[PDB]
Amino acid sequence: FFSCQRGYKGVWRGDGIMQTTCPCGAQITGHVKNGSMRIVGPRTCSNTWHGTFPINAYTTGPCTPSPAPNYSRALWRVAAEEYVEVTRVGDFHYVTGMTTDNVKCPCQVPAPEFFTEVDGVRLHRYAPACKPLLREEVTFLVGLNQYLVGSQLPCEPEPDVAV
Amino acid sequence: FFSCQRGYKGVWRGDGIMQTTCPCGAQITGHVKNGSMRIVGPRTCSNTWHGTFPINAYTTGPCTPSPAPNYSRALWRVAAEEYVEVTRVGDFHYVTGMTTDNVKCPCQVPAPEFFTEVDGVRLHRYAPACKPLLREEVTFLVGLNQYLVGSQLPCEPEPDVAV
Ligand SMILES: [Zn+2]
Ligand SMILES: [Zn+2]
């Protein structure tokens, strides 16, 4: 079969029993109580050993992923098949990449749970493949304004010169 | 729907037609002439846009991946289902992680093609699931000698500090 999917491990919102299937074919069960998920799976799957849960189109359950705000990068789906990469520096966020040049984009990042992917871990059951990320000489649209790649999001207060 | 696997892109040894399948379901064909690969795949698969080839148990064909030596890290299968992580610094290699404590390991690294994984890109058609990498207070073996995780391979000239 295929290699195992890099699973998610962190706080979950709402309790219950989560179900999913890893690309290696293994079925993984996550019992969520008080925000913590206990993993049950085959010794054959990597997620079992890491105590992680691979979120797929195969994932089932009532609980929701609740990622920590201190990620490095995230994949943000700003259209049905288009993404933008969000790089985090301290309290600020910068659009460091885009699947297409001139993609429209919101002026504020959402909560981590709204990202399709965070530091390599998928969080959504629905995720279109991600075309190559364009990180230079391209721009994104926030309303009617244009911003060169690498620009922090428009509605974010600029970092003062305190160092 | 599963995420696309990160595919290999680089020199191959031996010419012929390579065939494989991405976890996303896409069939991918790689045409190799003079160690170079032309990719034929669906616009729906990430490997198609990157012009990469996902090596799996579903991989078929006469060619062998021929990775570059300037890699940073790599998974080295040193048992049926055990791994050691290799980090490279210049011309030196260090066992920077392991699947289970006290794994017997060779004294020097092989050509990159013998690594199950190189910088997150699978190279082997056969790759058991990799358990969490123990990177602290654990040791590995080389013949009859024990080494603390982090030490460079015994059969390599040990450089001076500050070098
Ligand atoms: Zn698995
Ligand atoms: Zn694919």
Curated annotation (Swiss-Prot), chains A, B:
<comment type="subunit">
    <text>Monomer. Homodimer; dimerization is required for RNA-binding. Interacts with the mature core protein. Interacts with host GRB2. Interacts with host BIN1. Interacts with host PIK3R1. Interacts with host SRCAP. Interacts with host FKBP8. Interacts with host VAPB. Interacts with host EIF2AK2/PKR; this interaction leads to disruption of EIF2AK2 dimerization by NS5A and probably allows the virus to evade the innate immune response.</text>
</comment>
<feature type="binding site">
    <location>
        <position position="24"/>
    </location>
    <ligand>
        <name>Zn(2+) 2</name>
    </ligand>
</feature>
<feature type="region of interest" description="Interaction with non-structural protein 4A">
    <location>
        <begin position="128"/>
        <end position="132"/>
    </location>
</feature>
<feature type="region of interest" description="RNA-binding">
    <location>
        <begin position="1"/>
        <end position="163"/>
    </location>
</feature>
<protein>
    <recommendedName>
        <fullName>Non-structural protein 5A</fullName>
    </recommendedName>
</protein>
<feature type="binding site">
    <location>
        <position position="4"/>
    </location>
    <ligand>
        <name>Zn(2+) 2</name>
    </ligand>
</feature>
<feature type="binding site">
    <location>
        <position position="22"/>
    </location>
    <ligand>
        <name>Zn(2+) 2</name>
    </ligand>
</feature>
<comment type="function">
    <text>Phosphorylated protein that is indispensable for viral replication and assembly. Both hypo- and hyperphosphorylated states are required for the viral life cycle. The hyperphosphorylated form of NS5A is an inhibitor of viral replication. Involved in RNA-binding and especially in binding to the viral genome. Zinc is essential for RNA-binding. Participates in the viral particle production as a result of its interaction with the viral mature core protein. Its interaction with host VAPB may target the viral replication complex to vesicles. Down-regulates viral IRES translation initiation.</text>
</comment>
<feature type="binding site">
    <location>
        <position position="45"/>
    </location>
    <ligand>
        <name>Zn(2+) 2</name>
    </ligand>
</feature>
